[PDB]
Amino acid sequence: DVIIKPQVSGVIVNKLFKAGDKVKKGQTLFIIEQDQASKDFNRSKALFSQSAISQKEYDSSLATLDHTEIKAPFDGTIGDALVNIGDYVSASTTELVRVTNLNPIYADGSHHHHHH
């Protein structure tokens, strides 16, 4: 149904999900590193600024070593992964895997307006 995609560009770092298994209503699927967008911004915290609390130094508490996580939309099954750790991925350009719901009742069956 879906062809899932990352909220940023960079490169894959981890594979939380499994090719051919199931997914919860938004289980975490991938991790990315922001490659060279962060190249000017990484160095201060990588040396030392990570230890502080000031809003421009403290960024290791907000994004670690320049990572972003990716998650499913809804409950279902999930296809063969299209990517691995080191595949260069981009926000609509590379496509990570497909997500495919088991039945449609798990989002709008009768009362699911307080479940979805």
Automatic annotation (TrEMBL):
Q: Where is the Multidrug resistance protein MdtA-like barrel-sandwich hybrid domain?
A: 2-96
Localization of this protein = Cell envelope
| Source organism superkingdom | Bacteria
Family note: Belongs to the membrane fusion protein (MFP) (TC 8.A.1) family.
Q: What is this protein called?
A: CmeA
- Supply the source organism for this entry: Campylobacter jejuni
Lineage of the native species? Bacteria, Pseudomonadati, Campylobacterota, Epsilonproteobacteria, Campylobacterales
Q: Which gene encodes it?
A: cmeA
Q: Which section of the whole protein is represented? A: 61 to 210 of 367
